[PDB]
Amino acid sequence: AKRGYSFSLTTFSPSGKLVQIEYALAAVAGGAPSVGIKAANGVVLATEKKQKSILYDERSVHKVEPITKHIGLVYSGMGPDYRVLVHRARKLAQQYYLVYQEPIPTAQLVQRVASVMQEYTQSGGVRPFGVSLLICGWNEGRPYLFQSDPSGAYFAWKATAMGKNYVNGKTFLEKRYNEDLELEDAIHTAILTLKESFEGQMTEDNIEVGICNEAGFRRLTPTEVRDYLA
Amino acid sequence: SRRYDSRTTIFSPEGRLYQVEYAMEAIGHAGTCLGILANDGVLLAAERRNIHKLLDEVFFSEKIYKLNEDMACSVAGITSDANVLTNELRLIAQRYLLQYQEPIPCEQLVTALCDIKQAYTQFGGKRPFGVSLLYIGWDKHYGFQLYQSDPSGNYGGWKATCIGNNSAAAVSMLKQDYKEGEMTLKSALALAVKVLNKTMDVSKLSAEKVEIATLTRESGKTVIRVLKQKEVEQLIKKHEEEEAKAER
Amino acid sequence: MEYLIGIQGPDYVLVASDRVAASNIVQMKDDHDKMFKMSEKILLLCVGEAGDTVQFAEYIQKNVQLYKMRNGYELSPTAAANFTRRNLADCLRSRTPYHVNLLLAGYDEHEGPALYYMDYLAALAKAPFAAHGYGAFLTLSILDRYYTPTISRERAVELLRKCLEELQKRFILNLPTFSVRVIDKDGIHNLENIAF
Amino acid sequence: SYDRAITVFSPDGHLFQVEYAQEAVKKGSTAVGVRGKDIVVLGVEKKSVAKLQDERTVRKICALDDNVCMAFAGLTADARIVINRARVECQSHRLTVEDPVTVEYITRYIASLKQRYTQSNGRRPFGISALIVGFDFDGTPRLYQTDPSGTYHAWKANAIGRGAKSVREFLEKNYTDDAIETDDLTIKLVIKALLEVVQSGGKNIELAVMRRDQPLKILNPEEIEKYVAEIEKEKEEN
Amino acid sequence: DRGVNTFSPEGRLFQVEYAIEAIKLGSTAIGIQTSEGVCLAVEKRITSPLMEPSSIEKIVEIDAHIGCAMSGLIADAKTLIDKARVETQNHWFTYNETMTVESVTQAVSNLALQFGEEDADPGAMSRPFGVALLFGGVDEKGPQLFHMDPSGTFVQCDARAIGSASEGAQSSLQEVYHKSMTLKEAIKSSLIILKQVMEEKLNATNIELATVQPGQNFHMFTKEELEEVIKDI
Amino acid sequence: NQYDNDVTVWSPQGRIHQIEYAMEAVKQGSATVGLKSKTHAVLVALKRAQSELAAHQKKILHVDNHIGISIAGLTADARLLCNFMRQECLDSRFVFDRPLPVSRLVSLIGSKTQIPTQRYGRRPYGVGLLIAGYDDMGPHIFQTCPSANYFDCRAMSIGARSQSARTYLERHMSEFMECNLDELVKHGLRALRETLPAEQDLTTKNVSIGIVGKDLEFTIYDDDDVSPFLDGLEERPQ
Amino acid sequence: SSIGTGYDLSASTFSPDGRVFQVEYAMKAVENSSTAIGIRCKDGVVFGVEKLVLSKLYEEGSNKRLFNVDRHVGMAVAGLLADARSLADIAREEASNFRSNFGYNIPLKHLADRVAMYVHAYTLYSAVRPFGCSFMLGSYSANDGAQLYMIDPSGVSYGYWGCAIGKARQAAKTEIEKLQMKEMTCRDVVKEVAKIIYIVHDEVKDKAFELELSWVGELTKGRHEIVPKDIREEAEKYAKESLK
Amino acid sequence: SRGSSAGFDRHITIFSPEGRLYQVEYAFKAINQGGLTSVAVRGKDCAVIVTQKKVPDKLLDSSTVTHLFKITESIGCVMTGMTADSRSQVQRARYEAANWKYKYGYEIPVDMLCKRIADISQVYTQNAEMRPLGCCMILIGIDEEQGPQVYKCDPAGYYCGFKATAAGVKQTESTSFLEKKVKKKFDWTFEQTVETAITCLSTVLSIDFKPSEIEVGVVTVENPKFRILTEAEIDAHLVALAE
Ligand SMILES: [Cl-]
Ligand SMILES: [Cl-]
Ligand SMILES: [Cl-]
Ligand SMILES: [Cl-]
Ligand SMILES: [Cl-]
Ligand SMILES: [K+]
Ligand SMILES: [K+]
Ligand SMILES: [K+]
Ligand SMILES: [K+]
DSSP: OOOOOOSBSOOBOTTSOBHHHHHHHHHHHTSOOEEEEEOSSOEEEEEEOOOSSSSBOTTTOOSSEESSSSEEEEEEEOHHHHHHHHHHHHHHHHHHHHHHSSOOOHHHHHHHHHHHHHHTTTSBTBOOOOEEEEEEEEOSSOEEEEEEOTTSOEEEBSEEEESTTHHHHHHHHHHHOOSSOOHHHHHHHHHHHHHTTOOSOOOTTTEEEEEEETTEEEEOOHHHHHHHOO | OTTSOOOOSOOOTTSOOHHHHHHHHHHHTSOOEEEEEOSSOEEEEEEOOOOOTTBOOOSSOSSEEEOSSSEEEEEEEOHHHHHHHHHHHHHHHHHHHHHHSSOOOHHHHHHHHHHHHHHHHHBSSOOOOOEEEEEEEEETTTEEEEEEEOTTSOEEEESEEEESTTHHHHHHHHHHHOOTTTOOHHHHHHHHHHHHHHHOSSSSOOTTTEEEEEEEEETTEEEEEEOOHHHHHHHHHHHHHHHHSSOO | OOEEEEEEOSSOEEEEEEOOEEETTEEEESSOOOEEEOSSSEEEEEEESHHHHHHHHHHHHHHHHHHHHHHSSOOOHHHHHHHHHHHHHHTTTSSSOOOEEEEEEEEOSSSOEEEEEEOSSOOEEEOSEEEEETTHHHHHHHHHHHOOTTOOHHHHHHHHHHHHHHHHHTOSSOOOEEEEEEESSSOEEEEEEEEO | OOOOOOSOBOTTSOBHHHHHHHHHHHTSOOEEEEEOSSOEEEEEOOOOOOSSEETTTSOOEEEOSSSEEEEEEEOHHHHHHHHHHHHHHHHHHHHHSSSOOOHHHHHHHHHHHHHHHHHBTTBOOOOEEEEEEEEOSSOOEEEEEEOTTSOEEEBSEEEESTTHHHHHHHHHHHOSHHHHSSHHHHHHHHHHHHTTTSSSOGGGOEEEEEOSSSOOEEOOHHHHHHHHHHHHTTTSOO | OOOTTOBOTTSOBHHHHHHHHHHTTSOOEEEEEETTEEEEEEEOOOSOTTBOGGGOOSEEEEETTEEEEEEEOHHHHHHHHHHHHHHHHHHHHHHSSOOOHHHHHHHHHTTTTOBOSSSSOTTOBSSOOOEEEEEEEEETTEEEEEEEOTTOOEEEBSEEEESTTHHHHHHHHHSSOOTTOOHHHHHHHHHHHHHHSOSSOOOTTTEEEEEEOSSSOOEEOOHHHHHHHSSOO | OOSSSOTTOOOTTSOOHHHHHHHHHHHHSOOEEEEEOSSEEEEEEEOOOSSSSBOOOOOEEEOSSSEEEEEEEOHHHHHHHHHHHHHHHHHHHHHTSSOOOHHHHHHHHHHHHHGGGSBTTOOOOOEEEEEEEEETTEEEEEEEOSSSOEEEESEEEESTTHHHHHHHHHHSTTTGGGOOHHHHHHHHHHHHHHHSOTTOOOOSSSEEEEEEESSSOOEEEOSTTTHHHHSSOOOOOO | OOOOTTTTSOTTOOOTTSOOHHHHHHHHHHHHSOOEEEEEETTEEEEEEEEEOSOTTBOTTOSOOEEEEETTEEEEEEEOHHHHHHHHHHHHHHHHHHHHHHSSOOOHHHHHHHHHHHHHGGGSBSSBOOOSEEEEEEEEETTTEEEEEEEOTTOOEEEBSEEEESTTHHHHHHHHTTSOTTTOOHHHHHHHHHHHHHHHOOTTTSOOEEEEEEEOBTTTTTOOEEOOHHHHHHHHHHHHHSOO | OOSOOOSSTTTSSOOOTTSOOHHHHHHHHHHGGGOOEEEEEEOSSEEEEEEEOOOOOTTBOTTTOOOEEESSSSOEEEEEEOHHHHHHHHHHHHHHHHHHHHHHSSOOOHHHHHHHHHHHHHHHHHBSSBOOOOEEEEEEEEETTTEEEEEEEOSSSOEEEBSEEEEETTHHHHHHHHHHHHHSOOOOOHHHHHHHHHHHHHHHTTOOOOGGGEEEEEEESSOOSOEEOHHHHHHHHHHHHOO
16 A cells, blocks of 8 residues: 655756756767758658667667657657657647547647656656757648747757767757758767767668658668668 | 655755745746836837747747736746746636636736745645746736746836846846836836846847737737847847947 | 516616515515625626525625725626626536526726616627516517616616516516615715605 | 645745745835724835836725725735635625624634645645735624634734835834824824835835725825835934 | 655654644633633733723623633634534523533534545635633532543543643643642632733733633633732732 | 654664653553453552642543453553543444454554554654453453553553562462452552552552453442452551 | 664664664564464464463453454454554455455455554554554455465565464474474364463462464354363363363 | 656656656666566567566466566567566556457557557546556567567657667666677677577676576577577577577
């Protein structure tokens, strides 16, 4: 028999800073690098999927996940916490569709998912999520890219990077990224930003990449990743 | 269990609440947000803290929220806690409408949320919302109104006020310039740009760095608009041109 | 079976209610008041089930009074009527519903004189004139006949006179006394009770 | 639910959480109430409004019922809850019983509410003291006051907040029939006791009066300044 | 930091022992059980002449035949007093009779250690009551006086004193008590001992006096009647 | 110490201190003696007074017609367990119409007293009881503690200076089985006498006796009803 | 062997070296209690417990450490006896629930499995403490044969041919290893159980003791019951005379 | 600044200044407290489980001492770590597996069972009231569509599919052994996969053990039924190595 704690594990310090959120921000900042780019006619999301051993089955688990027909997810930080947010976001997407009979606007999903992240910064007996989410989507004939973080705050991006070397990844994108890209060009600059922080040689198994357009969201097959790696 | 309890809703030896006053410090590091009341309207002016070459700009605003047909608010503090409170403000405004079939009076909506925030300081053992809010609106009782909300759950009606970064410097600047009973919306818009320019950090002031929304009564209808970039550009440059005519 | 009536003018609302408190076949009271003071300018007249009427009417009365204390100003006739409608409609699909037929009369400083009709089902409708009870079937036609939206207070009481005389002649129930009150700019005024 | 004992006994036999709430009221604004012969009058101070702020919102005198009003000191956020809880109880007493609320009953309810918050799990006590003013149905004037512990007493005249120790001592010296003879001198007794501690100036005084049968009256900044004129006329002279 | 239901190495509950210490700050109250009635006396402790005299109620009526004197934290007491008044009328409704002074005291003693944090209701007690009570009345077992403290322990007393000066008044009652004392001497003794242990002089408005005797019901003494018992200093 | 604030905290030695601290409450209470023959079960306890003006505390309590108890420790914890014992005996008579066997009632105490020793925030019962009963298996003397552990015993003594009584009963434990009721009570009184200091002995005011057996239902003698047992006394020797 | 201050107060807290000390301290409580024994024979299971006499005032048969969980199941406990009785009640209810749901006598392995889950549940949270005792479960049938299981404070359950818990669990197990229990009749086993208890018992540290003995085999028709006074005293004489 | 601590981050499942969870990290060290090593290898036609079977004394019933557990007719598992923690996870796994079939009408896939337990293990990682389970579950079984499967779940909540995996005390040395055997592409038969698993545990521990000293559980394409090999069948594979 058990009964949970009813007191907040995230409190205000004398400085006025919620320490556990910034500590959760350290968990994502130390995780594997991820990059997202909004490119006029579509969105691309890419991440480092280096399992650091040849024993692993690279096909079993995925980091780039679909939420619905038109929305995808990538993360930096902890895998287990990310899974919870995926399952919650998939349910929120269906809850919206059952009520309105319309594919959920990306901005509306991120708002609903970020609100779940907010709970774990105030609710009793729980720690915040150690994950920053990268949400892509297509609705009203327009590409969307969003960032959700442990705080529960959300930001809209043209292009951004998170995880290891997120500071060097962003400055790279400031110079490299230009508006009005083609989707196929966006995959290149996504892998290029990922190469800046890699360490090792890139194979189609070492990285994972998903794309979102007017035809919906899908993860690129290992054969498709190999062709861009040249 | 009690070993890990932070004891959030507890009294200090001096007779004050620590978590409330620690939350006040979070507001001080957030964006500068001011509200000014005029004769023919009321406005909000806030510093954008989300500024980058790579930000997309999807929404109409960053810190300014529409709560009601006749009411709008601005925010300073933790944005996620702000999103929770503003969503609740939209709910309470609609619950009143459903019951009485007329818009909620400005003071009453502020009162309702302040009771929720006060409850978080007394019971539950939870951290308070680290947000200060500025409400602007119009009701059929007191006309154009401006309100300020604290994380303590305490409120007050103002003619001109500010919360956020360099807040004490901004209010004393307003105390000197504000002309009670003579203030028009055009004068208040000019005062907003004047206060922001001296208060803000980056010095020169930009259309991407500030956010202004006006609330006016037009043709028997309350009109709320978030000012366009081309409008803000003229407001900054009109103060810039008067900065050049100040020397001889 | 009881009787209510309201007549709205250009700047006033005239309301009348019978003073009979009846049990089975006996008249227990000759001077029972069926009017409830909500505000300085709001009156609620209730009719229906014996115990349900007073309990419901006073509950709304005390909540309108609670609003006055909490805000420093009173509810508008419209906001008051919509509040009573909400409370009755929420109890409609419950285990214990209130079988009350009511009539709300008020004066707003902006909108002016107001008169509201409401079912026991909780359907709200604004009317220039309305009547509750079985007597309405005999009086609504007289009201339809002589009513003009520009009726003076002198003529309104005389029109009420014509309606109450019809209840003495044709209506099978004995309703000899009526409470008559007028709401306007200055508030609620107690007027001479019409006896037969 | 949050089940932690907030207010507990100390080794010496003290309730610290209650005592800290009494430190919050001592930091609060100065509030004084005094019972007269025909009328009762409240007076609140330490207003210090920035004159850039609408003072209609920050009024510390609240009416609970038609015949009952109150003034508070301490945490102004806490006050709003107690005031609204008392206002709901005012109408509940009117629903359960035909009669309007007596001044002692409202005071007893507010006191019982404050007491419950000292002995209940998960919650801290209220950081306010209240001055309750009203009239009985028979017409006899009544003045009461509460505190965070949950105790209440009837008073002829009392002060709470900052400078309460100074104002209280003034009322002990100045409470006779010579000052209560008229309705005007009782109001003057408030202003004189108020202006004795505050940062001087009638602009910072908001006070309310209520007669035996009349509705509550919040006085104009004009009416109070006319009485401030009568105190300085008889200050350099007397 | 510890919980409210924590035992000391000695074998006592901390919160209870500390609640006993809260009584040592409250005003002194004295009850005397005479063969022909029970008298209760208490000091009001006036802080200011502005405070109303009859406002402080440290001796209250529970039933027609039962009186109760309180000491310590007055706010906690009136919660227990109301529960005692509810109990007497619940018993009257069910059994059509007046409760015994012992049963009333026992009913209040049931709320003693009903406090805690976890495994409790949302409105459950967080701490004990900082109150000591003296139940004095007349039932079918003659005149009786009972003493109760935060521990829940209640016992009959021939004469008992509780408050700030408890030991001083206890020794004064110890040498001036006969089990054959008259009610005239009973009130006299309580008044004599009261002025000795107080910081302020005995006035007619300064103290409360109550009598419960077989013949007449519980009686609250009026100012004029107090002046007839203070005439015999 | 830090392993002694909660019942849910085990000491490195393999002990729970809060149970042991609750056991100290039993020893601080006045002594009580329980013994049995083949036909009767007798409880003898020492009443205690805080002052000479105050009366003596109740030590023996009723449970049912066939079961009686003597308390040692906290009063409220004693009354709480007493009410549970009464309720279980009432439920047994309501359902089965036959008196609840003593063995089973004590087992229900053992089950109930165990619950709070394993839950956080809860505490052990600060009282030890001596249970005297009569059923199909004859007379019974049982012992309960703050620790849910219970004992079936021929004779027992708990409280202050109970060791002196414990040694007396241990010498005469073979005597009890063929003892006459009047002789059995005197053995219980002589054991309780050993607990008192040399200056004082058993009086009519500080002695309470409870008897249950084949002859009669459980009965408590206190004042005038006690003197027949005390009279006919072998003098206090050393 | 122990960590102070922080990592040993709660069962919801791991120590740096991956240990739950609250469970280990609960394991110390049983190590302090007197020895309980039980072995599996050819045609059943026999239990034996040394019961230290705290006072001669207590009845012969008081503080029973041998329980009847079910008509065919017996329990032998060692540790904090208060917890032992609650676990005996939990085991009784579990055997009762099985018959109410499935209509026959519960298999011993499953009963041991079910109760062990309840014991384990008290090792995960700060809200509750682990059980401060270890206990054995024994049964016999024609189908399942003789079975013997033992559960400790952590929630671990294993099958046994011979098992011992308490003060001298090591001194007992080495004496059990000598026996050919796979071939021995349970009548012969009782004699050997009684003597190992006497050898294990410390007469110079502990004052005195009583011997508790239990049946569950073919001679008792599959029912768990107490070893009669006649057979026990024969085994007690056997224990005293082979002690030389 | 690696390995910094502030507050109760060492006692409850909250973040450190670095953003780590020490309580989770200590739970991995609780797996080694069992004092045993488990190895799993996947072939083309089969999936094999192996773990050391230590029996301290002959007083213990050897048949009852096991870390090999059956969750489904098709799905088995090996447990490494705290024995009581391990059995709790097995009982919950059987519950989730049967609960899946009642809701969806088909046999639970090996990957889906592993994810479900990982999600429940995540709850202990986020909530502070309970500790994580100091155990490790390696699942085997054959998917009707994707062939043989070997999956592993953490006290942290991490789950993944593998070609070969080790767990426990000698985990780090046995994973490096398996890497060397993977690089060389053998013909992964039933005998090859069993012996690769056996020789792995026999080299890292260096024993050359008896049939009674180890446990083997297999899942094959022709026979998807999870089966424990017992003494006689393991003895056949042990004498096959010495040829
Ligand atoms: Cl809690
Ligand atoms: Cl609206
Ligand atoms: Cl006391
Ligand atoms: Cl005692
Ligand atoms: Cl692992
Ligand atoms: K009324
Ligand atoms: K105590
Ligand atoms: K220690
Ligand atoms: K058999």
